[PDB]
Write a protein that binds this DNA or RNA. Structure first.
Lengths: 227, 226
DNA sequence: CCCCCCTGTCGCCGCCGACGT
DNA sequence: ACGTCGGCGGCGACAGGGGGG
C-alpha cells in the first residue's frame, strides 16, 4: 500500500494533488530459483555470445532488430525528442459521459487520494463529476511511459474516491474478422426456446465471495505444511 | 491470426468447440540487448553463488523464500496435486446478468471461434446470451494456470461473436483505506455552480479516432529514418 | 509438419516514507 | 521546514516450453 505517484489533475488552473495507488495486488506467490545441489543462490551474468566475455550493464547498447536483422543504438536524443515525460501532471484532456468508454479498453485501475491539505478541491471535483455523471479522460506518465487513461468517480458509501482507468490506444484493440460466422446459420424456431430453460436452470446472481483460487490456497496450505 | 489454444465450452451435457484468440496486440517495439564493443547479441548464463559455476536450466532447482528467508526446496510431483488445470475446457459455472461485473475486475479480452465445420451450437448460444442478456461466468484455464473469467456477447459489424473476459479474484481488489476523505468540508452552493460551469465548459464526446501515442509514432519515424 | 507467444525470472532504476536536524 | 537513508515496485529483456498448422 505504498504510493507510486504524486502529481496533480490540471485542466487549466485547478491542480488538485493526487497520490496514485495500485488498485490490484496479486496475492499469487512468486518463487525463487536456486542451485539446490550445492545450495547456491542463482544470479544472471550478461555474457557476449560472439566475443564471449562477461560485461556490465552500462556497456550493452539497447539495440533493435528489423526484418533485415539490423542493430541501431538508441541515443539520448530519442529521449529528448518527446518532452511529455518531463511533466508530473495528469493533464486532463476532455470531460465526456462515462457511457462512451467500452469495457474492451480498460487495462488497469488506480485510486487517487489527495494531499491532506488540498482535500477541498479533491472532494469538490469528485462531487461535481458524480452529480453531472462525466468521464474525465486524461493522460498519464508513470516511469517515462505515456499511457492514455480515464478518470471516473465511484462512490464507496462512506467515502467517494475518483479513480483512473488506464486505456488501450483505440488502434491496439483487435477487430474480429471471422468468416465462419458470416455464413448463414439456420435454426428452427422451437430449437431456440429450449436453450432458455437450460440457461435459466443455472441462472444466479454474481457474488464475489464464492469464487476463490483453489490452486493458490492449496499451495499456501502446502507450503505451510512444508515449514 | 494465431490461436493461443483450442478447447471447448462444457457445462453438463452441453458442449461446443471454441478457438480462443488474442484480442489486444500491443504494437510497442521490442528491442534486443547488444553491446557496442563487438555488436553481438547478449547471452545470459545462470551462475551459482555458493559453487561459483554455471548451472543448467535442468540442473537448476526451484525454491521459495518465506518471511524468515529460509530456503524451501520444492518438488514438481507434490505441486501438481491439483487436477483442474489439466482440463482443456472452459467449464462454465453459472449464468449472471451482464451488468453485474464492475469494470474493476476485467483483466484481458479474448475472442472466440467455433472450431468444427458446423457452428450451430455456438451461434445458438450467442443468440440466447444476447436475448436473455446474461453473462456466463467460467473457470477459464490456460497454460496450467487457472484464472476466473466471464463469457459475454457483443456484435462487431458482421458477426455476433462472443468473448471471454478474464477476471481478478475478488480478494485481489484492494480497498481505499484512506481516513483523509471521510472528513466533511464546509462547501458553498456558489462553489458548486462555478465548478459545474468550468467542468461542463470543457465537456465533449468521445472521439477515439484522434487518440494516438505520440511517443510511439515518434520512435517509429526515428527508426524509419535510421 | 511448424515457429509464435504466454509465463516466470532477473536485474535495474526510480520513487516513496520515516528519522533526524 | 528540510536533508538522509533504506526499502519497494514498475518494466525491459531473456529463457523455456506449449500448441498453435
Amino acid at each position: 500500500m505504498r504510493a507510486i505517484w504524486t502529481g496533480s489533475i490540471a485542466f487549466g488552473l485547478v491542480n488538485v494533488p493526487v497520490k496514485v495507488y495500485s488498485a490490484t495486488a496479486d496475492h499469487d506467490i512468486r518463487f525463487h530459483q536456486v542451485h539446490a545441489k550445492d545450495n547456491g543462490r542463482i544470479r544472471y551474468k550478461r555474457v557476449c555470445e560472439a566475443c564471449g566475455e562477461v560485461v556490465d550493464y552500462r556497456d550493452l547498447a539497447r539495440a533493435y532488430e528489423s526484418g533485415d536483422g539490423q542493430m541501431v543504438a538508441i541515443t539520448d536524443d530519442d529521449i529528448a525528442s518527446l518532452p511529455e515525460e518531463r511533466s508530473r501532471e495528469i493533464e486532463v484532456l476532455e470531460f465526456v459521459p462515462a457511457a462512451d468508454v467500452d469495457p474492451m479498453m480498460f487495462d488497469r485501475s488506480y485510486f487517487l487520494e489527495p494531499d491532506s491539505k488540498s482535500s477541498k478541491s479533491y472532494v469538490l471535483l469528485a462531487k461535481t463529476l458524480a452529480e453531472t455523471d462525466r468521464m474525465a479522460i486524461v493522460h498519464f506518465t508513470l516511469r517515462n511511459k505515456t499511457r492514455l487513461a480515464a478518470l471516473r468517480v465511484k462512490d464507496f458509501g462512506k467515502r467517494e474516491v475518483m479513480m483512473v482507468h488506464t486505456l488501450l490506444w483505440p488502434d491496439e484493440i483487435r477487430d474480429p474478422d471471422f468468416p465462419v460466422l458470416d455464413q448463414k446459420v439456420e435454426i428452427k424456431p422451437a430449437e431456440l426456446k429450449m436453450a432458455g430453460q437450460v440457461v435459466d436452470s443455472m441462472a444466479d446472481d454474481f457474488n464475489p465471495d464464492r469464487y476463490h483460487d483453489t490452486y493458490q490456497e492449496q499451495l499456501q496450505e502446502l507450503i505451510d505444511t512444508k515449514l
